[PDB]
Design an enzyme around this catalytic site. Structure first.
Site, short mmCIF file in Angstrom:
data_model
loop_
_atom_site.label_atom_id
_atom_site.label_comp_id
_atom_site.label_asym_id
_atom_site.label_seq_id
_atom_site.Cartn_x
_atom_site.Cartn_y
_atom_site.Cartn_z
N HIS A 1 14.19 9.47 7.29
CA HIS A 1 15.21 10.45 6.77
C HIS A 1 14.96 10.50 5.19
O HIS A 1 15.69 11.06 4.35
CB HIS A 1 16.44 9.71 7.10
CG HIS A 1 16.79 8.62 6.28
ND1 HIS A 1 18.15 7.90 6.35
CD2 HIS A 1 16.13 7.46 5.76
CE1 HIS A 1 18.23 6.84 5.58
NE2 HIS A 1 16.85 6.74 5.15
N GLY B 1 0.82 -1.44 -0.05
CA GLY B 1 -0.12 0.18 -0.01
C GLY B 1 0.73 1.12 0.02
O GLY B 1 2.09 1.15 -0.39
N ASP B 2 0.15 2.41 0.45
CA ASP B 2 0.93 3.69 0.22
C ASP B 2 0.70 4.28 1.84
O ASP B 2 -0.24 4.45 2.24
CB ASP B 2 0.07 4.36 -0.87
CG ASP B 2 0.59 6.12 -0.71
OD1 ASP B 2 1.49 6.30 0.08
OD2 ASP B 2 0.16 6.73 -1.66
N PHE B 3 1.83 4.55 2.28
CA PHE B 3 1.71 4.89 4.04
C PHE B 3 1.35 6.48 4.07
O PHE B 3 0.97 6.95 4.91
CB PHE B 3 2.79 4.69 4.77
CG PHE B 3 4.22 5.06 3.97
CD1 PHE B 3 5.55 4.13 4.22
CD2 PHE B 3 4.53 6.19 3.68
CE1 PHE B 3 6.67 4.37 3.65
CE2 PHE B 3 5.81 6.65 3.07
CZ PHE B 3 6.63 5.62 3.17
#
Ligand SMILES: Nc1ncnc2c1ncn2[C@@H]1O[C@H](CSCC[C@H](N)C(=O)O)[C@@H](O)[C@H]1O
Ligand SMILES: Nc1ncnc2c1ncn2[C@@H]1O[C@H](CSCC[C@H](N)C(=O)O)[C@@H](O)[C@H]1O
Ligand code: NA
Ligand code: NA
Lengths: 332, 332
Positions: free
Chosen positions: B242, B222-224
């Site tokens: 980072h 998925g996409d965080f």
């Protein structure tokens, strides 16, 4: 220190090149030569983003280039002193040169090894010196970098050979001429001829007059693939043949043989490749000459092969207190 | 050893990166892993020009990477063994990664420092992960390089923190999961969720199987920036924040905060920046994060700021035997 950390430091060498390039190109060292300065002043005077410049300076300071004397305040160190502009031992031009076109050419060294096609020529569309002749700023940087490299070792070359016999010293592809100048300084009876491309020889002449050291040195602009000046007592090829493949090196040498009187001598001043596996800077410069120029450094035996093809015989290979050797040859 | 030679070796770090890249990309270590091989054979197998490959190999041999066992015959050394493919400690992907797009992006670090414009985005016209999602070969290299780095520090993280209280361990942007795997290995009763982009989570399964934790570890794609998986006992963000500026980092953290239960812990594993001038890999990686991602390594105080903006409070910063620290936080 695990082997993996040793290898990682080697793989990430490009980071060091570019981080030093940033500091050199922005001229930080000149700004801190008198006293340390706050980061906001350094950023303002160099046109950099202060937080980003801070990060670069903190990072190179950790390897001894600049120092954070107090939080957010940066001073000079011995290594950073070499990045000042216009000082006698300045390496600023070298740091600049290695971060620009040469860095980009080296991105394609793999293609060069696979195909034989010179990486610089693929990247920029013509020969290295053809490119520099179109771009005066890059030309200046190269000539100043090259002259700074040679200036630092010139004394060792002069201490290693007796120049007394020669009253006319012809330096072929002399650049700005630091080695010629050192020879003339040490031999007050000698006169010199600084031979290079017209644009380089013109700038070299002005540099000599500026420094007040051109009394017994004349400049000649020309093309060593066509002819070189006649009647010299010694012809000096310093850091010159490693710019050229065998075919072109032989051409240069035959033009030297044509021009030279029978009492003349030929001196090749270069990083002659040793036998064995010890570290030697010339092994690395050898690959730089591949990438830029499709050329190479050479062993003594390789020079012998060039000499036989150009009407010279190797007399001796004299060592110097530097990486360089003097390859002395006589006309036959 | 003159200072000028020390600085010249620093300025020419890029030569080392690229010369190792050639040997790594051509796969020379695999060819000589079991016995030394003559250059003709190496050239034939790799599609390289023999004389040019010989030059590269003898140059890197002089710094311990390969060895010329007899003239024109090359064998392995302990540093070159790290360039073999598919071995447990392989650094081949790291050597390849650093010689390709990352090298080219670093050519623009000056412009990035002057303007704040991310060098990779200038050079390639898209974000770093956007590029990798469309370039499968570069993607595999990146992910294997990243996992190789993290594998070498994962024990230091597990040694520094007691993971025994957690039944479910969720690793956000886990890549191929070497830290998650170390955690699960250490706690046989724990279950894991590996979360990353679909193409990465898809590929991670095979690596988790090899690591011996596949039976206890799900892979979620998925996409965080949209959502992360709910109800974990601990959420791990390792060498993740980072990669992102403050705003995007806060977006990630807020999604973790809404997914997390009240007893949950947040662990950030990163190269937290110290205040002094000592050497620290994180100082260099911070510049790499600038160049690639327009991001940064952070201080503890900087993490506190992000936490305030995302519903977390810092509990402790725990040191480890590596450069990494564990920033432990709790939901508020
Ligand atoms: N066709 C040509 N004719 C004359 N000079 C040439 C040339 N092609 C290249 N050069 C010059 O060859 C030099 C090579 S660099 C060496 C400079 C100097 N001899 C030193 O010891 O450092 C450059 O100055 C370049 O301008
Ligand atoms: N929008 C997104 N959603 C999910 N994962 C993403 C993402 N953007 C980047 N990533 C992932 O973030 C990871 C950053 S690299 C860190 C990998 C690992 N945690 C380690 O310790 O080494 C990559 O695996 C990348 O695929
Ligand atoms: Na930094
Ligand atoms: Na490349």
């Amino acid at each position: 220190v695990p082997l993996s950390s040793i290898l990682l430091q080697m793989i990430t060498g490009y980071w060091v090149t570019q981080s030093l390039y940033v500091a050199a190109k922005l001229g930080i060292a000149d700004l801190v030569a008198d006293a340390p300065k706050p980061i906001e002043e350094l950023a303002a005077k160099t046109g950099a983003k202060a937080p980003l410049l801070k990060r670069v300076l903190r990072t190179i300071a950790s390897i001894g280039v600049f120092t954070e004397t107090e939080p957010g305040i940066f001073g000079i160190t011995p290594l950073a002193a070499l990045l000042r502009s216009g000082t006698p031992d300045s390496m600023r031009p070298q740091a600049i040169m290695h971060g620009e076109e040469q860095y980009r050419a080296w991105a394609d060294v793999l293609h060069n090894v696979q195909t034989g096609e010179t990486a610089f020529e693929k990247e920029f569309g013509t020969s290295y010196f053809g490119y520099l002749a179109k771009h005066p700023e890059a030309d200046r940087v190269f000539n100043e970098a090259q002259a700074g490299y040679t200036k630092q070792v010139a004394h060792a070359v002069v201490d290693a050979y007796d120049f007394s016999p020669f009253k006319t010293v012809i330096d072929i592809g002399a650049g700005y001429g630091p080695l010629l100048s050192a020879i003339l300084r040490s031999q007050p009876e000698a006169r010199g001829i600084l031979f290079d491309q017209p644009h380089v020889a013109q700038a070299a002449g002005k540099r000599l007059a500026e420094a007040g050291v051109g009394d017994r040195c004349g400049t000649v602009g020309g093309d060593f693939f066509v002819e070189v000046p006649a009647d010299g007592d010694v012809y000096i090829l310093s850091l010159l043949l490693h710019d050229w493949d065998d075919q072109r090196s032989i051409e240069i040498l035959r033009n030297c043989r044509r021009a030279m009187p029978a009492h003349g001598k030929l001196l090749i001043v270069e990083l002659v490749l040793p036998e064995g596996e010890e570290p030697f800077f010339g092994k690395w410069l050898d690959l730089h000459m591949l990438v830029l120029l499709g050329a190479q450094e050479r062993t003594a035996d390789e020079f012998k092969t060039l000499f036989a093809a150009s009407g010279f015989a190797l007399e001796r290979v004299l060592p110097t207190a530097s990486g360089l050797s003097i390859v002395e040859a006589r006309p036959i």
